[PDB]
Symmetry: D2
């Protein structure tokens, strides 16, 4: 099965994930 | 614009997001 | 081992996690 | 205020975040 997903929603989610990915190192150190 | 995503990939993504979500009590409880 | 984290950083982290969590309906609804 | 957080919990969360960060590009393309 395939689901249509808005490209801009995946891009916004990617940005949010990237933001957490770059924030956690600061917390860990 | 829409991207055609495999339902199994969205199911994996959902599960990964839920695992992060359900880490919050452990992180916040001290 | 424990890391001393600023409460404001955990609050930011929590909010970031919740934003990702609350994206799931939009991603899954088609 | 400071909160004590288990280092291994932040490391596990980092791993989970990194896994999503590397998975979303595959979905987006």
């Amino acid at each position: 099965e395939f689901v249509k997903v808005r490209k801009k929603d995946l891009e916004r989610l990617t940005t949010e994930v990237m933001q957490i990915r770059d924030f956690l190192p600061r917390i860990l150190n």
